[PDB]
Amino acid sequence: SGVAKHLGEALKLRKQADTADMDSLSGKTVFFYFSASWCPPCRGFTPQLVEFYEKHHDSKNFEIILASWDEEEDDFNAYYAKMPWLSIPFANRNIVEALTKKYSVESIPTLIGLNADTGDTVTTRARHALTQDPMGEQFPWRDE
Amino acid sequence: SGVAKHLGEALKLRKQADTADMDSLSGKTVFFYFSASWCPPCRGFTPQLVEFYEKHHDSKNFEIILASWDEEEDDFNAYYAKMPWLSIPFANRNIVEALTKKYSVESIPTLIGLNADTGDTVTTRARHALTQDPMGEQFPWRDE
Ligand SMILES: [Mg+2]
Ligand SMILES: [Mg+2]
Ligand SMILES: [Mg+2]
Ligand SMILES: [Mg+2]
Ligand SMILES: [Mg+2]
Ligand SMILES: [Mg+2]
Ligand SMILES: [Mg+2]
Ligand SMILES: [Mg+2]
Ligand SMILES: [Mg+2]
Ligand SMILES: [Mg+2]
Numbered sequence: 001s002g003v004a005k006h007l008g009e010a011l012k013l014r015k016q017a018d019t020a021d022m023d024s025l026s027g028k029t030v031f032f033y034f035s036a037s038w039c040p041p042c043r044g045f046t047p048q049l050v051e052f053y054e055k056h057h058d059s060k061n062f063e064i065i066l067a068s069w070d071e072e073e074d075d076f077n078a079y080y081a082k083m084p085w086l087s088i089p090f091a092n093r094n095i096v097e098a099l100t101k102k103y104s105v106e107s108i109p110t111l112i113g114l115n116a117d118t119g120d121t122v123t124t125r126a127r128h129a130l131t132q133d134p135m136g137e138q139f140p141w142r143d144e
Numbered sequence: 145s146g147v148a149k150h151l152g153e154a155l156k157l158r159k160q161a162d163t164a165d166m167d168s169l170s171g172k173t174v175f176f177y178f179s180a181s182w183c184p185p186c187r188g189f190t191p192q193l194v195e196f197y198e199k200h201h202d203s204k205n206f207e208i209i210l211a212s213w214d215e216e217e218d219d220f221n222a223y224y225a226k227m228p229w230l231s232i233p234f235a236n237r238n239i240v241e242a243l244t245k246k247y248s249v250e251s252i253p254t255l256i257g258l259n260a261d262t263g264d265t266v267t268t269r270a271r272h273a274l275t276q277d278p279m280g281e282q283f284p285w286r287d288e
Binding site: 001002003004006007008009010011012023025027031086089091092094095098099102114115116117118119120 | 153155232
């Protein structure tokens, strides 16, 4: 795991125009958000997730990282511009493909929540959970 | 660290023509080898490291990962073709840049050894140590 940790920490995540380090994730719940500019149900969900994040990410101590299924860089940028959170850089498609496989992401939009420190999965149903609990009263929607 | 571990594990390392996963690193000493096709002292050291690896990587339980300072992809491939070990993919320049910063790699060839499981640094002087101990009798050349 140690080597993997160093390689992971060597990845710079996008933060809008900037790129950032990973310490900022310490002690938070972190979500990977699998979505694409071209996906119609994503287009309906992303605005709700944006609103939920702006309102609750501080108080509920979470971060979101876009894991984009856009393969065109201009579409990737147009879409990420609408988001207030972080992204795996467009160039790191390999990483998105691997995470997609890891979490059995068979459709989008999908939101996978995990403990930043342990790496343990917290929730795989947060896309559907959030639509039913827009206030986040049952956040982080733990599986089972 | 958990998020970083998942991102690291999502990176596929090059293994010659193939790309491989990271479990294969379990319980080994792992070295990052910082070098470039264009570097004259690298050209003199790489053949010795190749010979040392072929002879000892199994019995001394270690792996090597190229962290290339080549910025041209054809030169990167020509050079890596001479190596029997693994590489960070050419496309993952960002990662090489970060690891270079992390381990204060100010010149090449440089060999940085670490425990694969803990991630802890074992040796930062292995380039010079190996030339003086070609049999690896003092492997892994622990610092201080
Ligand atoms: Mg690092
Ligand atoms: Mg914030
Ligand atoms: Mg980008
Ligand atoms: Mg990648
Ligand atoms: Mg979901
Ligand atoms: Mg992974
Ligand atoms: Mg071998
Ligand atoms: Mg490559
Ligand atoms: Mg990279
Ligand atoms: Mg060295």
